[PDB]
Amino acid sequence: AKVFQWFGSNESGAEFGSQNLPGVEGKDYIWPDPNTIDTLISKGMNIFRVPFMMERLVPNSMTGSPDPNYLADLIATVNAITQKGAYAVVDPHNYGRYYNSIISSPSDFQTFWKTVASQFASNPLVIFDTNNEYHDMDQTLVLNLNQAAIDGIRSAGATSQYIFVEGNSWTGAWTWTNVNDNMKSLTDPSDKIIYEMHQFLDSDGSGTSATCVSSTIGQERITSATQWLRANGKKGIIGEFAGGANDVCETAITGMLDYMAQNTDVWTGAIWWAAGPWWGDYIFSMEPDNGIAYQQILPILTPYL
Ligand SMILES: O=[N+]([O-])c1ccc(O[C@@H]2O[C@H](CO)[C@@H](O)[C@H](O)[C@H]2O)c(Cl)c1
Structure with a gap:
């Protein structure tokens, strides 16, 4: 049936308006629509990645108590995804930073992660994503933060x-x-680490242009990572990818996914960026029924579902 272990979409919105903390639900940010997630599940997607802000879930100090109202909506979003059998990726969309400062304390990050994991520890369809897109920061620190997250998660009994x-x-x-x-x-004592990598297909790889470099750029840009995963005995997932609704990008997307389908010993699947209810005319919107990617990219993704 399905080609990959996981194939689905990001469900963005709870991390919107990040300049406004805590921000106001329904004004600065919004949670995903369970009904449009249901539509994507019906098409065969089985994984939904849910960005949220660390500062909205655990304000002020990441070692503190969660914000009950924001946590309630995270739980509602997650448990609805998983009630249908799909996996829900809990993604602190934070770039290795908390209140815009590099997270320099792995122990504080571990406590944050025990707190989060304790809210989902009996749900086997939750996936914990240590942090979205670390960047411009010490390389050993990135390793240590990921390890601290694992340690906190497993310490909560989320095994x-x-x-x-x-x-x-x-x-x-x-x-x-x-x-x-x-x-x-x-x-990881559970032996369940997946290396999540992102790949955009525009000139600079920022995923800000609907134009792709070439019809083969996706395969080109993930080939070395594929060999690193295999040589190092690891498994990976493409946690964000996108291209514009045009021929070159559509061919790049197909070529990337076809290459990945030939390498499922290491690639567990792929997650489109992004669906969610506040994207409007976004160049990559996967939101049913009118997102441009839902209209023009989904028909080239269904062969893998
Ligand atoms: O590796 N690069 O040469 C490179 C990586 C990322 C870049 O831009 C960033 O892309 C992120 C998504 O891939 C995006 O989330 C972020 O906002 C961008 O700054 C560039 Cl330009 C180059």
């Missing part, structure tokens, strides 16, 4: 769940081998 770890350089697949080699050393 059935996969943990998505992310590297430096915005966890890019194309820069993985030269930047993130030290990530090979991460340890």
